[PDB]
Structures are given as structure tokens and as C-alpha cells.
Amino acid sequence: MQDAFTKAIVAADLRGSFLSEQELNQLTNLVKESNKRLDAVNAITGNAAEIISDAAHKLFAEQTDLIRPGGNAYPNRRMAACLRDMEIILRYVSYALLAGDASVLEDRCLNGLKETYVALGTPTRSVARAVQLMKETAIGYVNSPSGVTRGDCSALVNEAATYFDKAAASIA
């Protein structure tokens, strides 16, 4: 796979050089945040089921037709798929969040997804929507926990966002 650390390495390798002191300081800093980073992930995983459940409800309230005969989320079988998919995307996002890198998400998950959706006739727009719905709910938890030491998580929160968004974009 790849992640923040490995990445920097690779770059350095092609230059043929030891790591720049500047570059170390990226990683040094990254370490410091770890604890925050972790809790973020933990929050998602802990609430996973819910995140989805929630997002779905809202998705279907909005786009009533998806669940109507002839729509894409009908019948049961399809509905199931649609739920499953949402979850997957989430799963990956989390992965990325820990790694500190989009890659894993892009390569395993997003790559080719659009075209699939197209071929099937799945409306990419709606998919994207769902991803966002998820995003907001997820942040909700990341950002409002209980029994965690109070401090600033923004930096992480934004990175989280970005991941969700890469998803939204590539699907859309």
C-alpha cells in the first residue's frame, strides 16, 4: 500500500538522497498528532453502523424515486447493494484517515467506480450525495466526543473532509 511515511521515503529515494531535515519535521509533527488522529478513527469505527443508517434515511427521504419501482434502489436486492456500497466507501475513508494518505482509498476503492455505476445505470449524482450525507454525520461524531481530552482536532477534521470529497468527486 502507501501512507504518509512511506510516501515521503519514496520521493526521497528517487532524488537518491537521505531525507531532508525539513521533511523529517513533517513526519515528526505528524507523530505528535497521532493520539488525536487515532481518536478520530476510533470515533468513526465506533459509530459506523449509525453513520450509514442515518445517511441512508436522509438519502431516501430526499430522492423518493430511488425506492420506487423502476428506481435504482428497488427492489430489496438492489437496496442491499446500495447500503453495502455506502459502507465500503466509509470503510476505506477510515483506512485513509489512519494512513494519513488518500492512496489506499483511490486505488482499492474509487478507481473505476464511476464507470461501473454508469454501466449499471446507477445515477452517479445520487451516489455522490450519499457520500456527503455520510461525511456530515461522520464529522458530527469525530468532532463532538465525550471523555476525550479537550483540544483542537480541526486539522484532522479537514483532512477527513478531503477524503470524503475525493470520493464524492471521483464517483460523480
Partner: protein
């Protein structure tokens, strides 16, 4: 009362660990993915070699470099890699030329599908196949067959399906595969004293149905 150590007091694992099937029972499945790290490739390769050759030891010279390269370019799937290994001098020398066709069939069954042979008819369709057409056509019929495709159809290394209930299983696979597996350090080996011999006794086959032909 409804909570109290039962008198048997066997563990969950217990039943597997007593048989020695603890690793194979719900075996882990190794899949090659669309873009693979250098480690995933090398895991898959190790898992194939271990499963096809029956945990027999493959030296550094025995390995087949080309098949592995093609697997690295993406030019062949894992299912094709399996066929290349199976259709190979090294496989043929271990499980085919020294044994009897009855012995080989049960081996290939185990190697390419973790079960043992379900009944006597399975020997008829695969022995006649071999006289009619090659070894090669026979081997293909295994990988080509729907059961290979339905499970581990593509990009998945074959894993033992024995020791877990599979739909349309015959009874008395469980016992049969226990004769074939015989523990994590055991390995079927062309080169043991008294040669290469069937473990599955032929009378237990007939114990499952035997139709005409």
C-alpha cells in the same frame, strides 16, 4: 442454573485443536488485487505453492519464474497461474507419474479443491476423461469446473473447503479429508518409504451411492 460450567466443558476451539485441523478449518482466503504491493504478490505466490504442492517443499530451483512474472505484469489472473503450476513437470512428477490414477485423482481434488472426492462417480468421470484426452484436459476440467469458478473463481488462491459444511456436500467428506490432511506438518510426498499410495479406501466410496456408471 442456566449459567453453570457444563460437565463436558470443552472449549469452542477444542474440537478443531484435537483433530489438528485448526489452521485449515475456516481457512483464510488470499486474493490478488487489481494493483498489488510487492508483499501481496509474494503472499499469494507462497500460498499457491503451498496448497497446490501439498506443503511439500519447493526449493529455489523448483520455482517457475515465468509464471510469476506474468502474474506480476497482470497478464494472467491467479486462476491461470494455478493452471500453469498444475500443468507442470514439477506437479506431474510429484503427484502423477509415481502414483496410480486413483491416487492422483484424490490428490488433485484436494489440491485444486480443498475437499476430498464426494463419491465413486467422481472417479469415473475423471478417469475416462484422462484416457479420452490428455492429462491437461483432465487438469483443465477441474479449474474449468463450476465449483472451482463458484468459489475462488478468479484472483483467489484455492483454499481447503473440507472440514466445513458446504452445500451439496456428501456426508463423509469430513472423515475422508481427515485422511488426506493429517496435520500441518504432514505433506504428501512422492518420496517417502513405500511410495505414493491412496489413503482413501475404496470401500468407503461405495458407501456413498454407486449408480451404474
Amino acid at each position: 442454573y442456566y449459567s453453570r460450567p457444563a460437565p463436558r466443558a470443552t472449549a469452542d476451539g477444542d474440537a478443531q485443536t484435537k483433530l489438528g485441523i485448526t489452521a485449515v478449518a475456516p481457512a483464510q482466503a488470499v486474493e490478488l488485487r487489481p494493483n498489488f504491493g510487492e508483499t501481496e504478490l509474494q503472499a499469494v505466490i507462497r500460498a499457491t505453492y503451498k496448497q497446490l504442492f501439498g506443503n511439500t517443499y519447493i526449493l529455489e530451483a523448483d520455482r517457475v519464474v515465468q509464471a510469476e512474472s506474468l502474474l506480476r505484469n497482470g497478464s494472467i489472473n491467479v486462476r491461470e497461474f494455478v493452471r500453469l503450476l498444475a500443468k507442470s513437470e514439477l506437479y506431474k512428477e510429484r503427484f502423477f507419474h509415481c502414483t496410480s490414477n486413483n491416487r492422483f485423482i484424490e490428490l488433485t481434488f484436494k489440491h485444486l479443491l480443498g475437499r476430498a472426492p464426494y463419491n465413486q462417480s467422481e472417479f469415473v468421470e475423471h478417469l475416462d476423461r484422462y484416457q479420452k484426452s490428455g492429462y491437461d484436459a483432465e487438469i483443465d476440467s477441474y479449474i474449468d469446473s463450476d465449483e472451482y469458478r463458484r468459489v475462488f473463481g478468479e484472483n483467489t488462491v484455492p483454499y481447503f473447503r473440507g472440514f466445513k459444511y458446504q452445500t451439496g456436500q456428501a456426508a463423509g467428506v469430513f472423515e475422508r479429508t481427515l485422511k488426506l490432511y493429517g496435520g500441518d506438518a504432514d505433506s504428501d510426498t512422492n518420496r517417502n518409504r513405500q511410495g505414493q499410495l491412496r489413503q482413501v479406501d475404496p470401500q468407503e466410496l461405495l458407501r456413498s451411492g454407486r449408480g451404474i456408471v
